[PDB]
Amino acid sequence: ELDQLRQEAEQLKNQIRDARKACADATLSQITNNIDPVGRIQMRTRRTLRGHLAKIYAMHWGTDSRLLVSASQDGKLIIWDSYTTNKVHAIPLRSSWVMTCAYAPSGNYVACGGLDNICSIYNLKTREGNVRVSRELAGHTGYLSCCRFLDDNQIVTSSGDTTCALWDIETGQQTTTFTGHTGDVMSLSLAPDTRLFVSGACDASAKLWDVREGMCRQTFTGHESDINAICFFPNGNAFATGSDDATCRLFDLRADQELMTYSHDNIICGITSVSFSKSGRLLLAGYDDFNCNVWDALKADRAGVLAGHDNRVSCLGVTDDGMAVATGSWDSFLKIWNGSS
Amino acid sequence: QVQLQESGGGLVQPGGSLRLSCAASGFTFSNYKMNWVRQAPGKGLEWVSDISQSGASISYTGSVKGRFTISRDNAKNTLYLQMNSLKPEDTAVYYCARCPAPFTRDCFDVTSTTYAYRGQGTQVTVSSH
Amino acid sequence: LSAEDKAAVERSKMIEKQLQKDKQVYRATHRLLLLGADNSGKSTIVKQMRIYHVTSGIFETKFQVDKVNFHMFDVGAQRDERRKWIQCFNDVTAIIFVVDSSDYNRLQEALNDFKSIWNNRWLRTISVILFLNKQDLLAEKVLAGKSKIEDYFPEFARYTTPEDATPEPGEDPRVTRAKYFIRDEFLRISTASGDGRHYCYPHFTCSVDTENARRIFNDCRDIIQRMHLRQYELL
Amino acid sequence: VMTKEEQIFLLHRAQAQCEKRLKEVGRPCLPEWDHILCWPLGAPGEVVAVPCPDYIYDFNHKGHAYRRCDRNGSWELVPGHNRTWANYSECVKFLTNETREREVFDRLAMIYTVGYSVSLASLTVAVLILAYFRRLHCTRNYIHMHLFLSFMLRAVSIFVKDAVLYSGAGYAGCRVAVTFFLYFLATNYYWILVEGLYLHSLIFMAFFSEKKYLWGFTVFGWGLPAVFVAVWVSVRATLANTGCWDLSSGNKKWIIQVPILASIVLNFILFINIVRVLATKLRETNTRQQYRKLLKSTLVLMPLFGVHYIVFMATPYTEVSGTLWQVQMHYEMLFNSFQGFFVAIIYCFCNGEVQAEIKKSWSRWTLAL
Amino acid sequence: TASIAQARKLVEQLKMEANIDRIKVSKAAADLMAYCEAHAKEDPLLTPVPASENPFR
Amino acid sequence: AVSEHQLLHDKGKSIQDLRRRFFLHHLIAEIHTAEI
Ligand SMILES: CC(C)CCC[C@@H](C)[C@H]1CC[C@H]2[C@@H]3CC=C4C[C@@H](O)CC[C@]4(C)[C@H]3CC[C@]12C
Ligand SMILES: CC(C)CCC[C@@H](C)[C@H]1CC[C@H]2[C@@H]3CC=C4C[C@@H](O)CC[C@]4(C)[C@H]3CC[C@]12C
Ligand SMILES: CC(C)CCC[C@@H](C)[C@H]1CC[C@H]2[C@@H]3CC=C4C[C@@H](O)CC[C@]4(C)[C@H]3CC[C@]12C
Ligand SMILES: CC(C)CCC[C@@H](C)[C@H]1CC[C@H]2[C@@H]3CC=C4C[C@@H](O)CC[C@]4(C)[C@H]3CC[C@]12C
Ligand SMILES: CC(C)CCC[C@@H](C)[C@H]1CC[C@H]2[C@@H]3CC=C4C[C@@H](O)CC[C@]4(C)[C@H]3CC[C@]12C
Ligand SMILES: CC(C)CCC[C@@H](C)[C@H]1CC[C@H]2[C@@H]3CC=C4C[C@@H](O)CC[C@]4(C)[C@H]3CC[C@]12C
Ligand SMILES: CCCCCCCCCCCCCCCC(=O)O
Ligand SMILES: CCCCCCCCCCCCCCCC(=O)O
Ligand SMILES: CCCCCCCCCCCCCCCC(=O)O
Ligand SMILES: CCCCCCCCCCCCCCCC(=O)O
Ligand SMILES: CCCCCCCCCCCCCCCC(=O)O
Ligand SMILES: CCCCCCCCCCCCCCCC(=O)O
Ligand SMILES: CCCCCCCCCCCCCCCC(=O)O
Ligand SMILES: CCCCCCCCCCCCCCCC(=O)O
Ligand SMILES: CCCCCCCCCCCCCCCC(=O)O
Ligand SMILES: CCCCCCCCCCCCCCCC(=O)O
Ligand SMILES: CCCCCCCCCCCCCCCC(=O)O
The missing domain is CATH 1.20.1070.10 (Rhodopsin 7-helix transmembrane proteins)
Incomplete structure (x- = not known):
């Protein structure tokens, strides 16, 4: 009986490949041959945030592009002022082994999680004037890998249970369960319209999810190793992926297939973090070789190198206005990068 | 898409010989280390043998030390494992498993219950008729 | 401008002072990782040192010996896959690995798990502590002779007792040969890779053994001393 | 060790001791500015040798040097102005500065x-x-x-x-x-x-x-x-x-x-x-x-x-x-x-x-x- | 065994994914090309803002 | 002992001794040796 179902499923896989091939007219690299190259980009460290004890694993940027939150494995969450470097809040986490952190769009809530399997939520704008644990979410049997905020009452959660879930802040229960991944889900990114989101798993595949329906729409299996980082294009029609096989891939929703791949011969180490710029022309990917590389999102050539970290970069973030880029690595140091005339 | 498919098996008289084959695709086979795993009926997954990227380093389990020979051909994109001197305790479903990251010297989740870089496996039964 | 920024500067100074105060207690405590299979007696070990020395995710056990704080974390209810979340444990003082030597069935899996941990790129900096649990069960079953070890490890029939093998005041020499062969098997994997970056400390441990805390404290002290000497470029 | 500033003090104290002892009561033939002899008070034709005085430093006080005082109050001298003939080189015994x-x-x-x-x-x-x-x-x-x-x-x-x-x-x-x-x-x-x-x-x-x-x-x-x-x-x-x-x-x-x-x-x-x-x-x-x-x-x-x-x-x-x-x-x-x-x-x-x-x-x- | 349900769900998911609309890669290429070009002037990273307007002095 | 304070003492002794040498030697030479 199982043989019949497996044979039926095998045939359907060929149909997807044929449909994807039928639309493959030309590579994106071919059509971009007439565009002007970006050229070498010089980036210098404008601000250096230090004070964390253990290695920094994740960070996020605020909507106002003024404050950012960073997570370190010492059990401390610190909110940094990018302009004047003062620390506005220090949150002593209940669990030291934290792997992710999120910043609410309204700036009133901050969430974090890790190996504790609990999504701790902290309220900043409190009537008393002190940070406290607002709500703690439990139900995941695996480690907490990533989380993002849709609004003040809804939060998207990614864990190692090969499943994602949408949580209600007030109810504290899973509104929907996102099932279909086979490996541990590493990270997810929300579209600008906060309508659809995609998440990468440890199975060399990516899936398109819908928060309203809770069912898969598109699947991309272009990568060869486990996908570590993922980020949405600012236009909402594409998204890039980073994996351990030292290559970066850009996928488009309408095309349902890859456009090109970013790779180079001296790079033998995978990518940990990846994000786009405001215009989307620059693709910044944090590699494991103690520095970050900037890739052209149309020409796929190297635009620059963000060196200065003694250890692997674990997180990368670009502000909503593209004014600066801040990178966090395992040396407990945060480097903010900006251009010059 | 990364996929693996093993071949070879069936009913073999005790003391016979076999030669499993699997054709890797969707990734650079020369840059990934490959391991072999069998699952005895009613028993968990156990490591069998492994071979380095270039084949310079080869190791075997104590229960299969010297019995089996494992080799890879990067040109033909195919992995091989010679099985001779079979005994009826060796009946198991043999799976071919890959390592998570390329250019690595550590291969962790091969013996895990669920793995995304292993083939469907082939049935190998050693019974005397 | 400066009037409003004064409060921010004072708050930043207070946060820095709190961070500096917490840094001392953070660095005073030593972090440890506990790894092992289901058959290994990790539960017995943690029960023994949590009583004598004072969905859920990972667990935490805090014990103090010789006025030194130690923290150890267990895997907990995590999935079988561990290649992804084990990289964060690369800053712990050492890993306590528990192996059941009285079964001869899951021993090969324990060897493979130890080899993967030792050869891991992130865990190659920090040392691993080896505990061979359930020695009494190993001694009893090898004395009975019903279950053999040569069938699972044919190299045992030609293996000889090391000259430096110091046994207990009284026990059958067959037990000594079996336990040291397993130890020699583990140290072969440990010495197969690593040019002095990390070391392995084999120790014989029983379920009711109350000296585990002392052995961990001595092993942690040796690792700290060796790391300091490495920083001095003396070793 | 005594330096030059102490040697001049010793010479001054010797001069003062001679001046106080200069008022006693043949020709005395009394020497001064020699910083060695203040001894003789008479007895023309003969004199006794004070052995290598000890109040000066760097001087082996184990020898003796001769002089002479005569009847008319004259001393043996070829160049005329070289008064108070002495034999001081027989006691110094330490010269030829080493380099x-x-x-x-x-x-x-x-x-x-x-x-x-x-x-x-x-x-x-x-x-x-x-x-x-x-x-x-x-x-x-x-x-x-x-x-x-x-x-x-x-x-x-x-x-x-x-x-x-x-x-x-x-x-x-x-x-x-x-x-x-x-x-x-x-x-x-x-x-x-x-x-x-x-x-x-x-x-x-x-x-x-x-x-x-x-x-x-x-x-x-x-x-x-x-x-x-x-x-x-x-x-x-x-x-x-x-x-x-x-x-x-x-x-x-x-x-x-x-x-x-x-x-x-x-x-x-x-x-x-x-x-x-x-x-x-x-x-x-x-x-x-x-x-x-x-x-x-x-x-x-x-x-x-x-x-x-x-x-x-x-x-x-x-x-x-x-x-x-x-x-x-x-x-x-x-x-x-x-x-x-x-x-x-x-x-x-x-x-x-x-x-x-x-x-x-x-x-x-x-x-x- | 209970693996039949997993195969049935995989078949259902593959069938659902099969009946979706797809667009040629030629149109996909132009969509990203135009978006980056339109916002290239407004990108501080692509076009360096003068230090006077740059908050990161 | 320390061999850098002993050197200072020895050199000072040498300098002072040489000065005293020159003094006593020139005085003795002038008063007595010129007659030899
Ligand atoms: C800090 C920024 C400007 C990066 C450039 C690093 C410069 C400042 C560093 C890196 C290497 C250094 C040199 C390394 C070795 C020597 C030889 C000797 O004569 C002492 C000084 C000198 C010449 C150092 C001067 C400072 C130096 C040139
Ligand atoms: C005369 C005795 C008492 C004093 C010791 C002097 C000799 C034995 C010592 C002093 C200086 C030393 C040398 C100094 C510099 C170096 C460079 C170091 O990169 C390697 C050894 C080498 C080439 C040494 C060789 C042996 C030497 C050890
Ligand atoms: C021996 C006693 C009397 C004198 C002490 C001085 C000696 C021991 C000291 C002074 C110079 C020192 C050396 C300076 C540089 C080097 C270069 C190297 O590649 C070997 C170490 C070595 C050789 C050092 C070792 C110790 C050393 C040899
Ligand atoms: C002229 C001398 C005094 C100057 C330097 C020599 C002395 C201080 C050094 C030279 C060789 C050294 C020895 C070399 C090896 C050993 C064996 C070890 O199990 C204990 C320390 C001991 C015994 C060392 C003690 C110090 C030692 C004796
Ligand atoms: C910078 C540190 C090490 C020393 C500073 C101390 C100053 C005040 C010392 C050091 C060198 C000294 C001078 C060195 C030599 C002489 C000649 C001596 O016949 C009279 C004092 C005289 C003129 C000293 C005056 C004071 C002096 C300038
Ligand atoms: C640069 C800093 C750190 C140290 C400076 C040291 C100064 C105080 C020293 C160095 C050289 C010295 C001079 C060296 C020699 C003489 C001749 C002496 O008959 C009078 C003092 C005099 C003129 C010294 C005065 C003090 C002096 C200028
Ligand atoms: C002024 C003394 C000499 C300069 C310093 C020499 C030692 C510094 C550089 C280390 C060299 C180590 C030896 C191997 C490589 C080489 O031959 O340079
Ligand atoms: C006299 C002052 C300068 C002395 C030379 C200092 C040079 C320091 C760095 C040496 C070059 C980089 C390391 C080369 C490798 C090695 O040390 O063997
Ligand atoms: C710790 C203070 C210094 C050491 C102890 C005091 C030493 C100074 C007093 C010595 C004696 C005082 C009289 C000196 C008379 C003289 O000049 O001969
Ligand atoms: C590296 C060894 C120590 C330093 C070199 C040794 C020098 C010893 C002294 C040599 C000169 C004096 C010899 C004895 C007295 C003499 O006859 O001049
Ligand atoms: C490692 C170097 C040791 C030697 C340092 C420099 C001294 C060399 C010469 C010293 C002894 C010879 C005396 C030279 C002066 C002379 O008498 O002409
Ligand atoms: C452990 C360090 C002790 C340091 C002091 C030790 C005791 C003093 C030694 C010298 C005392 C006599 C010298 C001074 C008297 C003098 O010459 O006027
Ligand atoms: C704590 C260890 C002992 C510390 C003191 C060590 C003293 C060693 C030197 C003693 C004095 C030697 C000279 C004596 C006088 C002389 O003969 O010139
Ligand atoms: C801690 C080191 C210093 C303590 C000892 C200081 C002793 C020297 C000063 C006092 C004594 C001065 C000389 C007095 C006369 C004598 O001792 O003959
Ligand atoms: C801050 C570093 C300073 C380095 C220079 C230190 C100089 C020490 C003294 C040297 C004096 C040389 C001149 C002596 C007087 C002369 O004979 O003109
Ligand atoms: C390390 C680089 C600089 C080395 C400089 C060494 C020589 C310093 C000056 C002293 C020279 C010897 C003493 C004076 C000799 C003379 O004036 O003839
Ligand atoms: C930073 C490198 C140089 C450090 C300063 C070196 C100064 C050396 C001074 C030596 C003075 C020697 C004087 C001997 C007599 C003379 O030649 O006047």
């Missing part, structure tokens, strides 16, 4: 000056390299920088002292130079001891709070030599305060000498314990290669400690000339002067962290083209 002492002094001065120069250059380079890189900031590196600064201060103080009172007025400058040289030498020795003390504490006792003993070690290495030098200068000024402090004044030398000598034994014992621990670790970690590593580590740790001071630590003060004095002086002015250069070479240029930082900085520089 070997000054040659040896100039040689030792040249070698120790060149050693201090090269050591100062190397240590300044090491201090600049360590102070530039932010990642090299650590307690070990802080104490290393303090030791290098102390070595440079000792070298520059030696250079200054070589010209304050050994070139070519009040004694204020010379005393200040001498006390600064002694203070810097004591601080250098105490910081050398502090290196081993900190290493032993970090290996044996601390096991925690390593950063909490930095200020304690700094105070112990800086303030205590300052107090010792203050006591020495107070004793020198209130006991004798004669001439400059360039010369010794008896047992007051042991006020500073014994403490700085004592640190050598403590650092020696600390080095004993640390080498024993290294050997134990090498034996426990498990061969003929172990001896090579033991020799490699024992050698490298030696300059950073008080070792090589034990060869001539217990030898007391000896004469200026002699086999023991010359070999000890050359040995010390070689190894003590070149110690800073060797320590800098070991712990800055050969350090793995510094080499990695230099490589990273050079790679970043060439990549910015």
Whole structure:
């Protein structure tokens, strides 16, 4: 009986490949041959945030592009002022082994999680004037890998249970369960319209999810190793992926297939973090070789190198206005990068 | 898409010989280390043998030390494992498993219950008729 | 401008002072990782040192010996896959690995798990502590002779007792040969890779053994001393 | 030892004693300005020889010199003005100034000056390299920088002292130079001891709070030599305060000498314990290669400690000339002067962290083209 | 065995994914090309803002 | 002992001794040796 179902499923896989091939007219690299190259980009460290004890694993940027939150494995969450470097809040986490952190769009809530399997939520704008644990979410049997905020009452959660879930802040229960991944889900990114989101798993595949329906729409299996980082294009029609096989891939929703791949011969180490710029022309990917590389999102050539970290970069973030880029690595140091005339 | 498919098996008289084959695709086979795993009926997954990227380093389990020979051909994109001197305790479903990251010297989740870089496996039964 | 920024500067100074105060207690405590299979007696070990020395995710056990704080974390209810979340444990003082030597069935899996941990790129900096649990069960079953070890490890029939093998005041020499062969098997994997970056400390441990805390404290002290000497470029 | 300023005092006291004894009551033939004879009071035709008077220094008082006084009050003399014929050359018995002492002094001065120069250059380079890189900031590196600064201060103080009172007025400058040289030498020795003390504490006792003993070690290495030098200068000024402090004044030398000598034994014992621990670790970690590593580590740790001071630590003060004095002086002015250069070479240029930082900085520089 | 349900769900998911609309890669290429070009002037990273307007002095 | 304070004492002694030498020697030479 199982043989019949497996044979039926095998045939359907060929149909997807044929449909994807039928639309493959030309590579994106071919059509971009007439565009002007970006050229070498010089980036210098404008601000250096230090004070964390253990290695920094994740960070996020605020909507106002003024404050950012960073997570370190010492059990401390610190909110940094990018302009004047003062620390506005220090949150002593209940669990030291934290792997992710999120910043609410309204700036009133901050969430974090890790190996504790609990999504701790902290309220900043409190009537008393002190940070406290607002709500703690439990139900995941695996480690907490990533989380993002849709609004003040809804939060998207990614864990190692090969499943994602949408949580209600007030109810504290899973509104929907996102099932279909086979490996541990590493990270997810929300579209600008906060309508659809995609998440990468440890199975060399990516899936398109819908928060309203809770069912898969598109699947991309272009990568060869486990996908570590993922980020949405600012236009909402594409998204890039980073994996351990030292290559970066850009996928488009309408095309349902890859456009090109970013790779180079001296790079033998995978990518940990990846994000786009405001215009989307620059693709910044944090590699494991103690520095970050900037890739052209149309020409796929190297635009620059963000060196200065003694250890692997674990997180990368670009502000909503593209004014600066801040990178966090395992040396407990945060480097903010900006251009010059 | 990364996929693996093993071949070879069936009913073999005790003391016979076999030669499993699997054709890797969707990734650079020369840059990934490959391991072999069998699952005895009613028993968990156990490591069998492994071979380095270039084949310079080869190791075997104590229960299969010297019995089996494992080799890879990067040109033909195919992995091989010679099985001779079979005994009826060796009946198991043999799976071919890959390592998570390329250019690595550590291969962790091969013996895990669920793995995304292993083939469907082939049935190998050693019974005397 | 400066009037409003004064409060921010004072708050930043207070946060820095709190961070500096917490840094001392953070660095005073030593972090440890506990790894092992289901058959290994990790539960017995943690029960023994949590009583004598004072969905859920990972667990935490805090014990103090010789006025030194130690923290150890267990895997907990995590999935079988561990290649992804084990990289964060690369800053712990050492890993306590528990192996059941009285079964001869899951021993090969324990060897493979130890080899993967030792050869891991992130865990190659920090040392691993080896505990061979359930020695009494190993001694009893090898004395009975019903279950053999040569069938699972044919190299045992030609293996000889090391000259430096110091046994207990009284026990059958067959037990000594079996336990040291397993130890020699583990140290072969440990010495197969690593040019002095990390070391392995084999120790014989029983379920009711109350000296585990002392052995961990001595092993942690040796690792700290060796790391300091490495920083001095003396070793 | 008595200097010229005391010899003139002795001559003045002799002149005064003669003047008081000049009013007694043949021709006395009374001599003065000779600063030897004031004895005879008469008896023309004969005189007795006073044997080589003792109130002058550097004069073997074991001979005798003859003179003559005659009937008419005349003395034997060919050139007329050479009165008071004497035989003073028969007792002096010590002439022909030797130049070997000054040659040896100039040689030792040249070698120790060149050693201090090269050591100062190397240590300044090491201090600049360590102070530039932010990642090299650590307690070990802080104490290393303090030791290098102390070595440079000792070298520059030696250079200054070589010209304050050994070139070519009040004694204020010379005393200040001498006390600064002694203070810097004591601080250098105490910081050398502090290196081993900190290493032993970090290996044996601390096991925690390593950063909490930095200020304690700094105070112990800086303030205590300052107090010792203050006591020495107070004793020198209130006991004798004669001439400059360039010369010794008896047992007051042991006020500073014994403490700085004592640190050598403590650092020696600390080095004993640390080498024993290294050997134990090498034996426990498990061969003929172990001896090579033991020799490699024992050698490298030696300059950073008080070792090589034990060869001539217990030898007391000896004469200026002699086999023991010359070999000890050359040995010390070689190894003590070149110690800073060797320590800098070991712990800055050969350090793995510094080499990695230099490589990273050079790679970043060439990549910015 | 209970693996039949997993195969049935995989078949259902593959069938659902099969009946979706797809667009040619030629149109996909132009969509990203135009979006980046339109916002290239407004990108501080692509076009360096003068230090006077840059908050990161 | 320390061999850098002993050197200072020895050199000072040498300088003072040489000065005293020159003084006493020139005085003795002038008063007595010129008659020889
Ligand atoms: C900090 C920025 C400007 C990066 C450039 C690094 C510069 C300042 C560093 C890196 C390498 C350094 C040099 C390394 C070695 C030597 C040789 C010796 O003569 C001492 C100084 C000198 C010449 C150093 C001076 C400072 C130096 C040139
Ligand atoms: C650069 C800093 C660190 C140290 C400076 C040292 C100063 C105080 C030293 C160095 C060289 C010294 C001079 C060297 C030689 C003589 C000749 C002597 O008959 C009078 C004093 C005089 C003129 C010294 C005065 C003090 C002096 C200028
Ligand atoms: C910089 C540190 C090491 C020393 C500074 C101390 C100063 C005040 C010292 C050091 C060198 C000294 C001079 C060195 C030599 C002489 C010649 C001597 O016949 C009279 C004093 C005199 C003129 C000194 C005056 C004071 C002096 C300038
Ligand atoms: C002239 C001398 C005094 C200067 C330096 C020599 C002394 C200090 C050094 C040279 C060789 C050293 C020894 C080399 C090896 C060993 C064996 C070890 O199990 C204990 C330490 C011990 C015994 C060392 C003690 C210190 C030592 C004796
Ligand atoms: C005469 C005795 C008492 C003093 C010791 C002198 C000899 C044995 C020592 C002093 C200086 C030393 C040399 C100094 C520099 C180096 C470079 C280091 O990169 C390797 C060894 C080497 C090439 C050394 C060889 C042996 C040498 C050890
Ligand atoms: C032996 C006693 C009397 C004198 C003490 C000086 C010796 C032991 C010191 C001074 C110079 C030092 C050396 C300086 C540089 C090097 C280069 C290297 O590749 C080997 C270590 C080595 C060789 C050091 C070891 C210790 C050393 C040799
Ligand atoms: C490692 C270098 C040791 C030697 C340092 C420089 C001293 C070389 C010469 C010293 C002895 C010979 C005396 C030279 C002066 C002379 O008498 O002409
Ligand atoms: C490390 C680079 C600099 C090394 C400089 C070494 C020589 C310093 C000056 C002293 C020279 C010897 C003494 C004076 C001799 C003379 O004046 O003839
Ligand atoms: C940073 C490198 C150089 C450090 C400063 C070195 C100074 C050396 C001074 C030596 C003075 C020697 C005087 C001898 C007699 C003379 O030649 O006048
Ligand atoms: C800050 C570093 C200073 C390095 C230079 C130290 C100089 C020490 C004293 C040297 C004096 C040389 C000149 C003596 C007088 C002369 O003969 O003209
Ligand atoms: C801690 C070191 C200093 C403590 C000892 C200081 C003793 C020297 C000063 C007092 C004695 C001065 C001489 C008095 C007469 C005599 O002792 O003959
Ligand atoms: C710790 C203070 C210094 C050491 C102890 C006091 C030493 C000074 C007092 C000595 C005796 C005072 C009288 C001196 C008379 C003289 O000048 O001969
Ligand atoms: C452990 C360090 C002890 C330092 C002090 C030791 C005791 C003092 C030694 C010398 C005392 C006599 C010398 C001064 C008397 C004098 O000559 O006027
Ligand atoms: C703590 C270890 C011992 C510390 C003290 C060690 C003293 C060694 C030197 C003693 C004095 C030697 C000279 C005596 C007088 C002489 O004969 O000139
Ligand atoms: C590196 C070994 C120590 C330093 C070099 C040893 C020098 C010893 C002294 C040599 C000159 C004096 C020899 C004995 C007295 C003489 O006959 O001049
Ligand atoms: C002024 C003394 C010489 C300069 C310093 C030499 C040592 C610094 C560089 C380390 C070299 C290590 C030896 C292997 C490589 C080489 O041959 O350079
Ligand atoms: C005299 C002052 C400068 C001395 C030279 C300092 C050079 C430090 C860095 C050496 C080059 C980089 C490391 C090369 C590898 C090695 O050390 O073997």
